[PDB]
Structure 1
Amino acid sequence: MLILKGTKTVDLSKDELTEIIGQFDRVHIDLGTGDGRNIYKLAINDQNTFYIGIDPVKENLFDISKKIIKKPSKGGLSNVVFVIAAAESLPFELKNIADSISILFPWGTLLEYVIKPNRDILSNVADLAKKEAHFEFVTTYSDSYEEAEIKKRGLPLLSKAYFLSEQYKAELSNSGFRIDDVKELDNEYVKQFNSLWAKRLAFGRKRSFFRVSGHVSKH
């Protein structure tokens, strides 16, 4: 398993990970975490949870990664690690570790995995979580082109009706996710997030966002 220490990637063993999370009552995993700013804000405000942000593009994380390793007086944190990995190839070391898991504003292939949904991929995501872990997926089209691309490929259109459908619910269930709630949210809700991408979404044109949440049932 590869983690980020500043701008450098280093190996982290299962045994090392175990020792780190031993100091926390809860563990949260944010998949496709982006620039790290969402995780940073959560972590600084909740020192009783260990936050794992996973992203395949390490350069997206450099700035926040450099911040978390500073002294506490300069913004350093001890309850955050950034894992460099993709949804299609998650580290075995993260199996059965999370009390909660989020996928926030995914785009491209990750978004397709969530909305189709891709059973094989979501099953591997569910494997990261402990029995009955909380989950939330928050989705929207990134831009008109992405909307057109997903639609051209014959993928389902993002709507509350679709996420409420018996078919989506059954498919997520087969992947190990029990949907408890589906909400349509607005730009104002998104303003709560701290990532640059979320700010751009929140303050840009009016857009529909959807939150599907519940608990991991696979276990």
Structure 2
Amino acid sequence: LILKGTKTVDLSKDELTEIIGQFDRVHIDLGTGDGRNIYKLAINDQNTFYIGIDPVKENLFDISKKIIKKPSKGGLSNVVFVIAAAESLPFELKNIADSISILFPWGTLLEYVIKPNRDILSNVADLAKKEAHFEFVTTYSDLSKAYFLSEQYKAELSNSGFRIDDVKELDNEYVKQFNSLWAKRLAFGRKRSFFRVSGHV
């Protein structure tokens, strides 16, 4: 299931493969939100096909309507919005991404990353190609770098297919570069700690 403007339509595996054809890389943003972050990534790199996934189609309507417009009007040819959840990812996305990101998650997705939920993370790892980079950027209260650096957390992620190569604590200034309304709120509000766990799959 993908969005064509405000309408939900079916995209087959063969159709997806055809679209991917004009691009050298594929990036998946899980729990993409309002689509503004992915829109910015896509506008700055036309050799990567961007796939934004979120179970809430309603919040993607504005940007979904924008990408279908003509190029001169803000339209993009390297973005697709998939309506799905981490617990039930589309089989068409298996082994397709060069990179996967989960940015400023909330709700169940945040817990799957922080706990972490090994089975769910395993499903997310299945979306990656043999290669593949990953990036999880989280924040809770306005846990800690130590937690994400612990052997237990590293082992749990490794079991799911994620090999941590770096853990960095980021600040509000860093988040000011993102365009989603949510990211702006997090960046402009009280001082908050953000953590990026990144590596390869």
In the superposition, the TM-score normalised over structure 2's length comes to 0.99
TM-superposed CA distance for 1:142, in Å, is 6.4
1:116 counterpart residue number: 115
Cα distance in 2 for partners of 1:25, 1:132 equals 13
- Give yes or no for contact 1:5–1:66 (8 Å, CA) kept in 2: yes
TM-superposed CA distance for 1:116, in Å, is 0.8
- 1:67-88 Cα deviation digits (max 9, x unpaired): 0000001000000000000000
| 1:70 counterpart SS class | coil
TM-superposed CA distance for 1:108, in Å, is 1.0
TM-superposed CA distance for 1:132, in Å, is 2.4
Please tell me the root mean square deviation across aligned C-alpha atoms, in Å: 0.8
Cα distance in 1 for partners of 2:66, 2:108 equals 29
Matched, 1:195 2:180: yes
TM-superposed CA distance for 1:124, in Å, is 0.3
TM-superposed CA distance for 1:38, in Å, is 0.3
Cα distance in 2 for partners of 1:106, 1:165 equals 21
- Give yes or no for contact 1:95–1:129 (8 Å, CA) kept in 2: yes
TM-superposed CA distance for 1:186, in Å, is 0.6
Cα distance in 1 for partners of 2:59, 2:139 equals 20
- Give yes or no for contact 1:132–1:215 (8 Å, CA) kept in 2: yes
Give me the identity figure in percent.
Answer: 100
- Give yes or no for contact 1:3–1:10 (8 Å, CA) kept in 2: yes
Cα distance in 2 for partners of 1:60, 1:52 equals 16
1:98 counterpart residue number: 97
- Give yes or no for contact 2:29–2:52 (8 Å, CA) kept in 1: yes
| 1:89 counterpart SS class | coil
1:51 counterpart residue number: 50
| 2:87 counterpart SS class | helix
- Give yes or no for contact 2:121–2:160 (8 Å, CA) kept in 1: yes
2:166 counterpart residue number: 181
Would the alpha carbon gap of residues 32 and 142 (structure 1) be closer, same or farther in structure 2, given more than 3 Å must change?
farther
- 1:115-149 Cα deviation digits (max 9, x unpaired): 11101000000000011200000000167xxxxxx
- Give yes or no for contact 1:107–1:142 (8 Å, CA) kept in 2: no
- 1:152-191 Cα deviation digits (max 9, x unpaired): xxxxxx1100000000000000000000000011101000
Would the alpha carbon gap of residues 11 and 142 (structure 1) be closer, same or farther in structure 2, given more than 3 Å must change?
farther
Cα distance in 1 for partners of 2:26, 2:153 equals 27
Cα distance in 2 for partners of 1:41, 1:112 equals 26
TM-superposed CA distance for 1:90, in Å, is 0.1
Name structure 1 gaps, 5 residues minimum: 144-157
- Give yes or no for contact 1:56–1:84 (8 Å, CA) kept in 2: yes
- Runs of 4+ aligned residues of structure 1 deviating over 6 Å after TM superposition are none
- Give yes or no for contact 2:141–2:192 (8 Å, CA) kept in 1: no
1:21 counterpart residue number: 20
TM-superposed CA distance for 1:64, in Å, is 0.1
2:38 counterpart residue number: 39
Cα distance in 2 for partners of 1:105, 1:142 equals 12
- Give yes or no for contact 2:145–2:168 (8 Å, CA) kept in 1: yes
- Give yes or no for contact 1:56–1:86 (8 Å, CA) kept in 2: yes
Number of residue pairs the alignment of both structures matches: 201
